[PDB]
Structure prediction request, 604 residues.
Amino acid sequence: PLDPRIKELLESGFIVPIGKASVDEVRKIFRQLASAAPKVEVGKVEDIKIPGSEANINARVYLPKANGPYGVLIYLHGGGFVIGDVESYDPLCRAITNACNCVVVSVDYRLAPEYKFPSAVIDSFDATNWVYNNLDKFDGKMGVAIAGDSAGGNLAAVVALLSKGKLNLKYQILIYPAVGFDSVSRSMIEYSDGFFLTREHIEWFGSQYLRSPADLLDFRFSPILAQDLSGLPPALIITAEYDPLRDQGEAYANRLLQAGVPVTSVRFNNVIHGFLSFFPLIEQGRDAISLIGSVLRRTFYD
Amino acid sequence: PLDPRIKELLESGFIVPIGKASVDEVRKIFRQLASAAPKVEVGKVEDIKIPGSEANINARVYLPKANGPYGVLIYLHGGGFVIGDVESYDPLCRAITNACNCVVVSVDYRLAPEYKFPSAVIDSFDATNWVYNNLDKFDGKMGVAIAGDSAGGNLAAVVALLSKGKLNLKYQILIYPAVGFDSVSRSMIEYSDGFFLTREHIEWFGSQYLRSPADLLDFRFSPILAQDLSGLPPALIITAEYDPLRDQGEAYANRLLQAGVPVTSVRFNNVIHGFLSFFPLIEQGRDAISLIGSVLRRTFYD
Prediction:
């Protein structure tokens, strides 16, 4: 069953009312919930402007206290391609930074509904590509990995695919990712209601981001439909037990493993989707952050 | 499915013949297998004698290269209460030392069939107690945690029970633990044969360690039967997806959570029982080691 602490939490109305409130109202509510986390002190934090193919892309750069040279992690936030942003993700990104002793670049990719698919993907790629061609700006001799949660994990996985034969990414980290259309998994059926992320939420997000049903079959939304998953970066995939998106995350893990990509797939029991964003209330989140950090420390510094 | 690497490895043959050879033969084979893992260099390493209630208990003490003061980890090796020892677990204990920047004290508890239940339990408890009362010998200001894998996870869990009211342990880490008797769980049935640890191995070990079937209900062999799990130290429980012991480990995590004890329960997917001992071969082992390390670092230092 659910961790009791998390049942107490849900029963007291901890929620983001996706599809029952306006886009701005839900952005504000998620900002508030995620700002409740403290911000660990790190090194220098600057905001930058990345010259994208279609837009001028804001990113926030976190350096650790540790001296360089560094590995660089591109971090793509979750929020269903509609909510979240650099500011709301700042506590988590700080915490990853201090756990990985690496440079984190949190990308403010363009959001729906104002910008539809595949805009978020194109921004996430263009930022990855640019950061990779400008490591000198970040003291990034040890290379670049990519990470994200919810939609961000989607964008991370898609970026890695798009990067095959163009970029040598060290590593990809998929935190409870969405990896494609799913009307059948057991996790989607059984945890469709009452575990914070709902089937209605997933449907609502797609109503805002996708342009037509044809986009459901496009690999830049459903990476699990990609034709060839071979030679992608090695992966850490984290999954939650009580999460409609569980079974798909684990499917993607298995498919990567089947195409010879090394994957470590970890299911965090007793917890819900999005638990890293609420690490102060859900201790297991701290442990996931620790996993992420110490895996990146190995692959960047031997 | 199984990570393809672990499937090729099991089809190759990768076996300790627990059913079939003599006690000395399987001990010698398990020793062969386990020290094809590299010994990472840590600080000073010495062998000590711990004055137990029934015996002098050998232990190896590993200091990290980092400066103190330290937390201290009591480590209790697996091997079905019959195989394994300090020497076989040396590479793993070194790996943990390095990941935790903490002192590790690996205990050579008495083994079955020469010393039956509850001899292992007693030695593991006496060692824990002695370390806890002699922390000045380890520059151990930051406290004591306890950890173990297979039977060692059983013993670590039990020592934590036995220590309620007596010892303030900071943390327990149970790595694919045996938590009692299980004739019935899906994982036990489904992964009885073909996944390295088999049902026949479990029966055989049981037959060497326990004195009569009454021992099966004794909380010092089946901690999940304990009358009151509340007030135990916070826990990290690691399980393996393709392990007959998986379901019982996750049950213990659930039953601890239900008693108010904080638990991070984490299932490593695609792997088998014992995977940490084989980290050179099973990369996920290295990531589990990092998790353990980073969790101990937060608990002790800060």
About this structure: Chain A has nine helices and eight strands. The two ends of chain A are 38 Å apart (CA to CA).
